[PDB]
Design a protein around this ligand. Structure first.
Ligand SMILES: [Cl-]
Ligand SMILES: [Cl-]
Ligand SMILES: [Cl-]
Length: 118
């Protein structure tokens, strides 16, 4: 049910990013969708990424260090994985949903990370 709702949300974020000409605006709309347990990491390209502001956050390094997440990122493919993340005190297991998006030829990714309650 976390997957269902987070996968739905991810694709909306995808629609939003893809259908605004102004990405900075599309990001500010997007951040309003992250709840106290969910955070978002938008990765447009190698030099450009942006994090939902403030337990549930995920970095480019945490992604590149997950072989299944990194593959998805590299290969521009959707991924749904449940895992603890690397290099964090908050090693709590999270649901993670990554979804590709494209704008003006700029292929990007939107990763969503949700804290899993015990
Ligand atoms: Cl990046
Ligand atoms: Cl911030
Ligand atoms: Cl520690």
């Amino acid at each position: 049910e976390a997957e269902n709702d987070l996968t739905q949300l991810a694709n909306k974020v995808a629609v939003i990013l893809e259908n605004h000409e102004d990405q900075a605006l599309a990001r500010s709309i997007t951040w309003e969708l992250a709840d106290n347990l969910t955070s978002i990491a938008i990765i447009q390209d190698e030099k450009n990424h942006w994090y939902s502001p403030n337990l549930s956050s995920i970095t480019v390094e945490q992604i590149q260090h997950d072989k299944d997440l990194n593959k998805a990122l590299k290969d521009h493919k959707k991924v749904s994985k449940r895992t603890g993340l690397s290099d964090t005190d908050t090693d709590n297991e999270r649901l993670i949903v990554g979804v590709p998006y494209e704008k003006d030829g700029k292929k990007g990714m939107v990763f969503l990370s949700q804290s899993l309650l015990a």
